[PDB]
Every structure is written in structure tokens, then in C-alpha cells.
């Protein structure tokens, strides 16, 4: 017998959005300089031919795939001119994000003790390193497959891919071949870039604040333990694990909405709910920023 | 000169060019499956690119040209397949899939207070197999087409702006009330969505649905008696329908086999019991509850 599945290339779509810039005044088409998209790591993506939707609105697309779950700054050099001859003496700047706006998904736990694999995968998929995880061949292939088809897979196909991925993760050295484990083991199998706060600073918060540039994910192994409110730079906090005692859940933020994902249960949460999350066993162990 | 930036990921076209996969129950001999056939819900054959074997059990191919959106497609593996155990297939094998989203639906705010009908109709139209024909029709206001294309991939703020523009352009149309509450059918008339009046020839709504022309997907239920969820025929292909609670419209839409109730901006997942409990008409008024039903 045969089973048919459809895998739409929507992730790659998220990597080549169609950006649109609307201006306060009518702009002269030939004043528009070359627009550059720039990332938090310094890399610049070029912008394709400009299409004018109105005397004020222009539309373009990155020349090359942008990174996933990454923030990008649109830089319009100085020199644009209005239809009245005015000029912009300053580079104009805006921003956007290559992340999904739809709500997170739930990953089943058919093992009974696969909480930690699911939580770690939830934190990784919402991670700025998802593209970097997906390119490392040393990573089990099935995990990469689950992480690329995450948002766009039938639940049935997501469930089969998850079974195969859990199988391949337990097959690794770092991860238990059976039974429960730790989020850190799965992240190490994923080759996720983390910043141990023991390296460096004296506490977790100071290492997060006084960390090298472009450090997004932190592993909190210093003292004191932190709660949600203690996490620095809340404006960029996008994911973090929470440990309820032999059970891991994920807290992941999408399009300004926080969600709590316990295996296959996605439930939306507000900031006040999060602020009640205590720190005591470490509660928050991995904190992922954008 | 200041700027406002928006990001619209090309998710709609992505759904129209999927990569299809067939997994088999047993290891298959690579040379036993030489040609697979893709066919559309109208029977037309769609051309397919090279066949790729990802494993002894899994094959992967891709449409040559964009498929239609929110549309069903049937895959046939011809007879002659052979397993590694010598077995053979005396009959052509068949499966199916649809180019529709698996993501959960979105919510549309109602700042008007009486724009329930616009939101409900747009929700039904976006889950329609005729979405491509609506988006290509120049007679439909351009803001509405933009909203219907950016439905799944737009920021909540950007979707809200698009919705304001779409409601504005809709109320301006002849079909739709310039102000105040209204009816789903007026929005469908503006969108020019193909509808099949069951009052037209048939004796019941359901019998008109069953004995309808081929490839009739959207129905306007204007015969007697009114139908409940259970009375609607062919539940297996039902993907959307409206529900009217008395001057207030909600939508019921199915995605990846899961039904959702969208009351303006409130998306809530529902089970079969909730639907089977939905009444067919109000006792005092006598008003039809479900009037538009959309199939795949």
C-alpha cells in the first residue's frame, strides 16, 4: 500500500519574504538608492529589482535566501528625494523578522519519557541557529527533516518524522538510548551553539548582558537561578525551557504571543502568567534570544 | 521622509508547488515503479518531473507546473509494482492529498460591530478551492485579493490593516451594504465566488447537493428544509460552512482534518459533537442557520 504526503516549500518562502516599504511622502523613483538588508552578524543580503505599488510604496525581495528566525534591518542609504525636491540627509532604517507568525505546534510524546527531546526541539526550531543546525551534516538527518517540515507538515507526517527523529537522537552517544534525560543532552546532539554562563562576569544575568556580540542562546549554570522576570532583555527573549520536575515544557514566542508547549499541548500565555514562573532544581536552563 | 516596513512570505505560491511523496508498506524494486500519474479533481492529468527514490519504501516527485490551491489531487501508482519478496500488484494503487494549509486558521477582528458577515465570508473564501480564481479576478477589489493572498503569512498588525482596507473596499461595492450589518451572500457576490443555488433544479437542499453538476464545490442552501451539520451530505469533503447565531456570524472551517470555529477574532478548535449539536434553524424566527457550505 501507499501513503501520499505533501511537503510545501514554505520555510524557504520564509527565507525570501517580499518586503514592502511605504513612505510618508511621494518619492522620486530615481532617488531610491540601493537598499541593503543587514543582519546581527554583519552579513548583508542584496535586494532585487524594485517594483512600485504606488507613488509611496515600493516592493522588493532579497537576492538570496535570508537566515531563518533571524532579525534583519532594512537600510535605505541617505539620498532619497521627495517629489518636491526634499532630501533625506540621514540613512533611513526599518526592521523585520524571518520567523513564522502562525502559532507553534505540539509534538507528541509516544515514549512516555520523551519530554526533553520535544522541549529541546521546540527551543531549537524557534532559534536563530535553526539554519545553522539544519546545515550541519554531523546532525542526524531525520532531526533536520523534522525541523525543516515543522510548521508545514501534516500532523501525521510530523508524527512519523518525530518518531524517526527521536529514534536517531537516542542513537547518539550524548542522549539516553532509552528513558528520560536532560535538555542539554539533546542540544549537544543538535550541535546547538550555547553560551555557558560559567565561562566569562559572575552571575547568569551579567554574563547574558556582558556576553560577546551576537550571543543568542545561553545555558544558565551559574548562581543565582533566574525566573522569567529576572531574564534580561525581555524585548528579545523568544524562547526558554521550563522544568516542572521530571518534565520539560517549552515557552516560545511568536508574533508577539507567548505559548506554552507541553508535548502536544500548545496553550497561549500572557506575560503575567510568565512572571509567576519561579526559579526553584533550576527552572529555566536555556534562554534563547533573537 | 519616514518609512513603514512589511514582510509577506510567499507562502501561498509555496502551497501551489509542493513536493509530493509516496511511502510504501514494503521495500519496492526500483524498476517496478517507472511512471506515476497525477490527476486533478476534474480528471485532467498533471505532468510530473523525474521520480526520486528516497528509500526502498519512499518515492518523491514534484509537479511540473503550479497546482491549484485549496484543491484535491489524486495519485495513481500503476499496476506492476514488485516487492523485494517477489510479490506483484495486479491492480493500480491510489492515494490522495490536497494543496491546502495545515497551519491553524487566523482571526479577523470586527471593529465595525456589524462586519461579522464580511469576516465570515472571507474566511469561507480563503478555504475555497476557488481561491485562485477569486485572486485572479480583476473585478474583485484589489485590497480584498491582497488580504486573501497574505492570509497565512502576514503579521497580525499587517493583516489588520489589510482587513480594514478590504472591508472598506467591500462596503463600497454594489453588492455589499455601504454601512450596517449584512449577509454572507452579498460578500460572496462581491468576491464573485461560484455558488450553486439549491432552490434551482431536485427537491431538497441535500438532494440538490448530491445530484449536482460535476466539480460543484460551493453551495448556497436556499431550499427546504434547512440542514444541520449532520444533514449536510458527504461530510468527508466538507471543508467550510457558515453559522448564524442571530445577527452574528461565525465560520466553521476544516484544516488538516481539524474543525475550527472562528467568531470574528476567536479561533477555537471544535469536535464532532459540537458540530452535531449545532441547530439547523432558530425556533422563534424560523431562520436558516447554515446557508453556505464549501467542499473540496
Numbering used by the authors:
A (entry chain B): 194 to 393, 396 to 475, 481 to 490
B (entry chain A): 193 to 393, 396 to 490
What do the authors say?
The betaproteobacteria Burkholderia pseudomallei and Burkholderia mallei, causative agents of melioidosis and glanders, respectively, encode the TssM effector, the only known bacterial DUB belonging to the USP class. By solving the crystal structures of isolated TssM and its complex with ubiquitin, we found that TssM lacks the entire “Fingers” subdomain of the USP fold. Instead, the TssM family has evolved the functionally analog “Littlefinger” loop, which is located towards the end of the USP domain and recognizes different ubiquitin interfaces than those used by USPs. The structures revealed the presence of an N-terminal immunoglobulin-fold domain, which is able to form a strand-exchange dimer and might mediate TssM localization to the bacterial surface.
To better understand the evolutionary position of TssM within the USP family and its possible relationship with the Josephin family, we solved the crystal structure of TssM193–490 to a resolution of 3.15 Å. This construct comprises the portion of TssM predicted to be structured, and upon crystallization revealed the presence of two globular folds: an N-terminal immunoglobulin-like domain, followed by the catalytic DUB domain. The asymmetric unit contained two TssM molecules forming a possible dimer with a contact surface formed by the Ig-like domains, with some contributions by the catalytic domain. A single β-strand formed by the first eight residues of the Ig-like domain is swapped between the two adjacent dimers. The two chains are almost completely resolved, with the exception of residues 193 (chain B), 394, and 395 missing from both monomers, and residues 476–480 being disordered in chain B. Both chains have identical conformations and can be superimposed with an RMSD of 0.63 Å for 3,221 atoms. The DUB domain assumed a papain-like fold with an active site triad formed by Cys-308, His-442, and Asp-457. When matching the entire USP folds of TssM and USP7, the resulting RMSD of 5.4 Å is unusually high. This discrepancy is owed to the fact that the TssM structure lacks the entire Fingers subdomain, which is in accordance with the major deletion observed in the multiple sequence alignment within the respective region. In TssM, the entire deleted region is replaced by the short helix α6 flanked by flexible loops, which appear neither related to other USP domains, nor do they structurally correspond to canonical USP elements. Whereas the Ub-PA–bound structure contains two individual barely interacting TssM ∼ Ub-PA complexes, the apo structure shows the Ig-like domains in a strand-swapped dimer, in which the first β-strand of each Ig-like domain folds with the remainder of the adjacent molecule. The β-strand swap observed in the apo-structure does not appear to stabilize a TssM dimer in solution and might be a crystallization artifact.
